[PDB]
Design a protein around this nucleic acid. Structure first.
Ligand code: MG
Ligand code: MG
Ligand code: MG
Ligand code: MG
Ligand code: MG
Ligand code: MG
Ligand code: ZN
Lengths: 98, 84, 24, 125, 206, 155, 127, 60
RNA sequence: CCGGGCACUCUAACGGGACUGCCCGCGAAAGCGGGAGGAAGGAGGGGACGACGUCUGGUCAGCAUGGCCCUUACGGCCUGGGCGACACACGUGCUACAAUGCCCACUACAAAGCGAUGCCACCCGGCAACGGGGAGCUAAUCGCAAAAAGGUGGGCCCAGUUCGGAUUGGGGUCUGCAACCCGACCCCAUGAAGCCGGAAUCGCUAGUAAUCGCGGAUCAGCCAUGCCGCGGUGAAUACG
C-alpha cells in the first residue's frame, strides 16, 4: 500500500517517468491505482522589461510544477525490486510513502 | 494615542548614566544620541542634551513631560516660512 | 462607506476585523 | 429632553439623539439606552419622564460630556504645547500633528488655499 | 528597443534549457547559484576550446555538467590530466561530488555561440569588422545552414560615432516560432570600448 | 465605425411581457450592471401603473415611448464658417434611443423619493402628454423647425 | 427512464438529470425557486422546456457549481436543452432555431498589463 | 553597487532587522526575488538564456 | 459521512474539430452577400510575437565598458538627522457628496493564488486589534476564506442626515534593538470639506465600459488607494 507522488517542471518528463513506475510494478504486484494527474501549482514572475523607468514594459514568466499519483497497493518484494533498481528521469523528483 | 505595550523603552546609555548622577548631584548637560529614549521620573530635574542630527540641544526635563520620548523636544527641520 | 473604518465595509476595505467586522 | 450640559435632543430616535451631545455618539448612545432599559427606537418626545430620568442620570454621571470635555481636550492641547513637544509645535503652527505629508493635502488643517505667484516656464507638473 | 531573445522565445518548442533539474522551492536559489558558480569557471578555465554550452543536470548532491566544445583535447589535457584538474578544483566550489563530461562540437561553423566568439575575437585583435562579419556569415552559410546573420555594434573600427554592421544570408525568420535558430552573443573588450557581437544560425525548421 | 455599418445589438425579450423595448427600457434604468435591481424598479412601476390606473402596464409604457419620440432634431454643422444648427429627420432607431433615455432621465428628475414611483408616474404623464420627457421631445422639435432656414443643408 | 445534459456558461457547470414527472425542479438540493429567489432572470433557465412543451411533463434534478447564479441559470439552460435532445433527438430541429444548444463562449477578458483592466486605459493629463 | 556595500553578506548584523537582500548576480537590491535570489533584471536575462530550469514565458 | 462506483463535474496529457468544405446568388479570378449543418464560421474570443529604420530617445545608480577625475580621502565604519520638510503649482489616484442609497441581521453563488519558525482550524480571555492554548497540512485531502455586489427582513425619511469620514483629544494591540522626527491596526470621543464640480480634458465598441469583491510579488512590520492578476453582475452607442 505504497503511494507514490511524482513532481516535475516538464510534463512529459513525468508522463514518461510515472508511466514506467506503473508498467514496472504492473507485473510484480497489483496493477497500481493508475497514474493520476493532480492540479498544477503555478509561479508567476512579472518583471519590467527594461532596466530603469518604463513601468509599462513587464514581460511575463512562470514556473509550472506538475504532479502525479500512481499509488501502488499490495507490494511484493519484486514489486519493490522493479523500483529501486530501475531509474532514469532527471527533471523528476519522487516521493514514495505508504 | 501612542503605543509601546509593556516595557516603556529607555536606552541604558543615559539610564544607567542618569541614576548614577542621582546618587550624587546634577551634571550640567548630558549629551545623548538616544533620541529614542522614554523620559522617566528620575530624568526629571536633569538636563539631557539631544542631537538634532546636527547639534546637541539643552533640554530641561520636567515632571509634566515624563513619558514623552527624548528628542521630540529636539526638532529636526529648520523651517521659518516661505514668505518673502 | 469604504472610507469609514468603523463599519462593516470600512473594515472589509481596510481588510481588517474588529468590533464592526467580527471574525464570525 | 435636556439630558446633558444645556443639551436637548428631540423628535428623533433616542439612540440617535444622544449623539447630539458633545461627548456622546453611537457607541456610548447604544450603551446608556441599554443600561437604562429604554428602547432606542422611541422618539425623544415619546420618552417617559421616568425614562428621561434614568437616561439623564446615567449619561451625566457615567461620563465626561459637553463643556467639561471641550475644556479637557483644550487643556491637553495647551499642555503638550507648553513643552517643546513636537505635537506642541505642530499645534502652534496649525499644521497636522500625526505625520501626514504637508507638501500637499493638508487643507483641512491649513485652512483655505492661499495661492502665491511662481516660476512658470518649467513643467511644474 | 525590441526583439525577444530568440532562444528564450522558443524554450517550450525547438529549444531545451541549459539546466534541467526537478523541483525545489527551498533550494532553487541555491542550486541555481551553484549552476552559476559552475558556469563561472567553465566560462574561463575553458575558453580556449570553444566553450559553446554548459548543460547541467542534478539529483541529490549529484551534478552532471556537460561542457560542449569544439576542441575537447584542450579540455581533457595531456593524456587526460586536466579534465582531472577541473573535476577536483571544481568540487572545491561545491562538495556535491560532481561528474563532468566533454562532448565535442561537430562543426563549430554551425554553432552561433562560437561564431560570435570568432568575430568578437578578430575584432579584439583588430580586423576589418565588415569583413569579419561577411566571412563568418559565409562560413556558417558555407557549412550547410539554411540562413545566418551577424551583428557587430559598438564603435566599429575605433570610430567615435558608434554604428552597427549588418550582414546576413538565407533565411533567419525570428518570428516563425519553430524555425530553430541558434543564437549567440559575444562581448569584445577593446582599447577603446566594448562591441557586442550577435550571431544567428538557422538550421532546418520543423 | 469607419468600415462596416455597425450591427444593432438584438437583446432578449422581457421575462414578463416578452418584449424587447422593455429590456431596452430596463437597461436604461440599470446602472453599474445591476440588471436585477433595474428589473424590479420597472416591474414594480408596472404594478403602480395598474393600480393608480386601470390600464394595462405594457400598453401605457408603449404609449409613453411613442409620445417622447422626437421626429426632428438639430445637428450642428460648420458651413462657410459658422456652425448652423441644422434641422433634419430622426431615424426610427435613434427616435427610440432618445425616447427611452429621456423617459429615464425625466423620471429621475421627479421628486417622489422611491425610484419605481418616479418611473410609473413619468410614464403615465408621458402617455398623457406631459412631464419632462415630452417637454424635451417638444423642446427639441421646437428647436428644429425653429432653425428651418438652415435646412437646405439637408445632410 | 432518465436523461442528462452538462451545460456550461461563463465558468459555471450544471448537471441536468431530466426525468419524467410532475414538473418540480431541484437545484443543489433546493427547490428551483428557492435557490433562485428574487432573481427576475431565473425563469430563463427552463425556457428550453417551454420550447417543446415539457416541465409539466418532466421533472429535473440539477447540479450546479462555479461562477454566479446568473451564469448558473444559463448553464442549467444548456443542460436542460441538451438532455431534451437525448429524450427525443427530433427536438433539435425545433430546439436549435432558438440556439439553446449553443454554448455561449463569452468570457472574462484577461487583465493586460499597462492598462487598468484589459482595456480600461490609464488616463493622461495635458498630453 | 559598491563592493563595500555588499557587507550584507556579513551574516553578522547587530540586529536582524538590518539584514536585507541584494541580488546574487548583479548585486542589486531594489527588486530581488526570494525564490531566485536574483533581481528583476538578472532574472529576465538568465530566464531568457534558459538557465532558469522550468522557468519560461507565461502566455494566456 | 461510511461501504462502494467510476458514470457525471473536475483534474491533466494526448487527440479530434472549421477548410469558404457544403447549398444559393454576384464574380474573370481572388473574393463578397446569404443559407445549412455545427459548441464554434469565414482571422470564433484573448495572449506571446513587433520589419529596415526613426529620435544625438532612456539608462554609465542594475550590470558591463573607453576616457577623465579622488586615492587619509570624491574610499570605509558608526550614531543621529534627511530622502516624510511647506505659502504655494501640476500629474495619477482613493473616498464621497447619498434613498437605483446608508445601516444591522439572516441567507447564497467564484476564480486565481499563497503557506516552516509558515498558513493557522477549534477553545478560552478581551468591546476589539490581539493574547494564551492547541488540531491539521509539507498542502486537489489542512489553513488563509469572509467572496462582495446579490436574495429575505428590519431600521433611517431627504436632513449636510443613521449621507461623508477629514481633523484632533484619549486609551491600547502587534512588528521590530528601537516606531519623537517617521509604522500599521483596534476601541471611545471628535466629525471637517463635500449637494456632483469653470475654461479645459480622459477611458472604453462586449462579457468591453461601469460596478463588486478575491489573490500575489516585495515584505519584520508598513504608509498598497500603487502594480500584476482572478472571478461575480453586466449595459449604452456607432448615421457617418
Ligand atoms: Mg457612515
Ligand atoms: Mg472584471
Ligand atoms: Mg527590511
Ligand atoms: Mg541625449
Ligand atoms: Mg521620495
Ligand atoms: Mg478597438
Ligand atoms: Zn541582479
Amino acid at each position: 500500500k505504497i503511494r507514490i507522488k511524482l513532481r516535475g517542471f516538464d510534463h512529459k518528463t513525468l508522463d514518461a517517468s510515472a508511466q514506467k513506475i506503473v508498467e514496472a510494478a504492473r507485473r510484480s504486484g497489483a496493477q497500481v491505482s493508475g497514474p493520476i494527474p493532480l492540479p498544477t501549482r503555478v509561479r508567476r514572475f512579472t518583471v519590467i522589461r527594461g532596466p530603469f523607468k518604463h513601468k509599462d514594459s513587464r514581460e511575463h514568466f512562470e514556473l509550472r510544477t506538475h504532479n502525479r499519483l500512481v499509488d501502488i497497493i499490495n507490494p511484493n518484494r519484486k514489486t519493490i525490486e522493479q523500483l529501486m533498481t530501475l531509474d532514469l528521469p532527471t527533471g523528476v523528483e519522487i516521493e514514495i510513502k505508504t | 494615542p501612542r503605543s509601546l505595550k509593556k516595557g516603556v523603552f529607555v536606552d541604558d546609555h543615559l539610564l544607567e548614566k542618569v541614576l548614577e548622577l542621582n546618587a550624587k548631584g546634577e551634571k550640567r548637560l548630558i549629551k545623548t544620541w538616544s533620541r529614542r529614549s522614554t523620559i522617566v521620573p528620575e530624568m526629571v530635574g536633569h538636563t539631557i542634551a539631544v542631537y538634532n542630527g546636527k547639534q546637541h540641544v539643552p533640554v530641561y526635563i520636567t515632571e509634566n513631560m515624563v513619558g514623552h520620548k527624548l528628542g521630540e523636544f529636539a526638532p529636526t527641520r529648520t523651517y521659518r516660512g516661505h514668505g518673502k | 462607506g469604504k472610507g469609514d473604518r468603523r463599519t462593516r465595509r470600512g473594515k472589509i476595505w481596510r481588510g481588517t476585523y474588529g468590533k464592526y467586522r467580527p471574525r464570525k | 429632553a435636556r439630558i446633558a450640559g444645556v443639551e436637548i435632543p428631540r423628535n428623533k430616535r433616542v439612540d440617535v439623539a444622544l449623539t447630539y451631545i458633545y461627548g456622546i455618539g453611537k457607541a456610548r448612545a447604544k450603551e446608556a439606552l441599554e443600561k437604562t432599559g429604554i428602547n432606542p427606537a422611541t422618539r425623544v418626545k415619546d420618552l417617559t419622564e421616568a425614562e428621561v430620568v434614568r437616561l439623564r442620570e446615567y449619561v451625566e454621571n457615567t461620563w465626561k460630556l459637553e463643556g467639561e470635555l471641550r475644556a479637557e481636550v483644550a487643556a491637553n492641547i495647551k499642555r503638550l504645547m507648553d513643552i517643546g513637544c513636537y505635537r506642541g509645535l505642530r499645534h502652534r503652527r496649525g499644521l497636522p500633528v500625526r505625520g501626514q505629508r504637508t507638501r500637499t493635502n493638508a487643507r483641512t488643517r491649513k485652512g483655505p488655499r492661499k495661492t502665491v505667484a511662481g516660476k512658470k516656464k518649467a513643467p511644474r507638473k | 528597443g525590441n526583439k525577444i531573445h530568440p532562444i528564450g522565445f522558443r524554450l517550450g518548442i525547438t529549444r531545451d534549457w541549459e539546466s534541467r533539474w526537478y523541483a525545489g522551492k527551498k533550494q532553487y536559489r541555491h542550486l541555481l547559484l551553484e549552476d552559476q558558480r559552475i558556469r563561472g569557471l567553465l566560462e574561463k578555465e575553458l575558453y580556449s576550446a570553444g566553450l559553446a554550452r554548459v548543460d547541467i543536470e542534478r539529483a541529490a548532491d549529484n551534478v552532471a555538467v556537460t561542457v560542449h566544445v569544439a576542441k575537447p583535447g584542450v579540455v581533457i589535457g595531456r593524456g587526460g590530466e586536466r579534465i582531472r584538474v577541473l573535476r577536483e578544483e571544481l568540487a572545491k566550489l561545491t562538495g556535491k561530488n560532481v561528474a563532468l563530461n566533454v562532448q565535442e562540437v561537430q562543426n563549430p561553423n554551425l554553432s552561433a555561440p562560437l561564431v560570435a566568439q570568432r568575430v568578437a575575437e578578430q575584432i579584439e585583435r583588430r580586423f576589418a569588422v565588415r569583413r569579419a562579419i561577411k566571412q563568418a556569415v559565409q562560413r556558417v552559410m558555407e557549412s550547410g545552414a539554411k540562413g545566418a546573420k551577424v551583428i557587430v555594434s559598438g564603435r566599429i573600427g575605433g570610430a567615435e560615432q558608434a554604428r552597427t554592421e549588418w550582414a546576413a544570408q538565407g533565411r533567419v525568420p525570428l518570428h516563425t516560432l519553430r524555425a530553430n535558430i541558434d543564437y549567440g552573443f559575444a562581448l569584445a573588450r577593446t582599447t577603446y570600448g566594448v562591441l557586442g557581437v550577435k550571431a544567428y544560425i538557422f538550421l532546418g525548421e520543423v | 465605425a469607419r468600415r462596416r455599418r455597425a450591427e444593432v445589438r438584438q437583446l432578449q425579450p422581457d421575462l414578463v411581457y416578452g418584449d424587447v423595448l422593455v429590456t431596452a427600457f430596463i437597461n436604461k434604468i440599470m446602472r453599474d450592471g445591476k440588471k436585477n435591481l433595474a428589473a424590479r424598479i420597472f416591474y414594480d412601476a408596472c404594478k403602480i401603473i395598474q393600480e393608480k390606473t386601470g390600464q394595462e402596464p405594457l400598453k401605457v409604457f408603449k404609449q409613453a415611448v411613442e409620445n417622447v419620440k422626437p421626429r426632428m432634431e438639430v445637428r450642428s454643422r460648420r458651413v462657410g464658417g459658422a456652425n448652423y444648427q441644422v434641422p433634419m429627420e430622426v431615424s426610427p432607431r435613434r427616435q427610440q434611443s432618445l425616447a427611452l433615455r429621456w423617459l429615464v432621465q425625466a423620471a429621475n428628475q421627479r421628486p417622489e423619493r422611491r425610484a419605481a414611483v418616479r418611473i410609473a408616474h413619468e410614464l403615465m404623464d408621458a402617455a398623457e402628454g406631459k412631464g419632462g420627457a415630452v417637454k424635451k421631445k417638444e423642446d427639441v422639435e421646437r428647436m428644429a423647425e425653429a432653425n428651418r432656414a438652415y435646412a437646405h443643408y439637408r445632410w | 427512464e432518465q436523461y442528462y445534459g452538462t451545460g456550461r456558461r461563463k465558468e459555471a457547470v450544471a448537471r441536468v438529470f431530466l426525468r419524467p414527472g410532475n414538473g418540480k425542479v431541484t437545484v443543489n438540493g433546493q427547490d428551483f425557486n428557492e435557490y433562485f429567489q428574487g432573481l427576475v432572470r431565473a425563469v430563463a433557465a427552463l425556457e428550453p422546456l417551454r420550447a417543446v412543451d415539457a416541465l409539466g411533463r418532466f421533472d429535473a434534478y440539477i447540479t450546479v457549481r462555479g461562477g454566479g447564479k446568473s451564469g448558473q441559470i444559463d448553464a442549467i439552460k444548456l443542460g436542460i436543452a441538451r438532455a431534451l435532445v437525448q429524450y427525443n433527438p427530433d427536438y433539435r430541429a425545433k430546439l436549435k432555431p432558438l440556439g439553446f444548444l449553443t454554448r455561449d463562449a463569452r468570457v472574462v477578458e484577461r487583465k493586460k498589463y499597462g492598462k487598468h483592466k484589459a482595456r480600461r486605459a490609464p488616463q493622461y493629463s495635458k498630453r | 553597487a559598491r563592493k563595500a556595500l555588499i557587507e550584507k553578506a556579513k551574516r553578522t548584523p547587530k540586529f536582524k532587522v538590518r539584514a536585507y537582500t541584494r541580488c546574487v548576480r548583479c548585486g542589486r537590491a531594489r527588486s530581488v526575488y526570494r525564490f531566485f535570489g536574483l533581481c528583476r533584471i538578472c532574472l529576465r536575462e538568465l530566464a531568457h538564456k534558459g538557465q532558469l530550469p522550468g522557468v519560461r514565458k507565461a502566455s494566456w
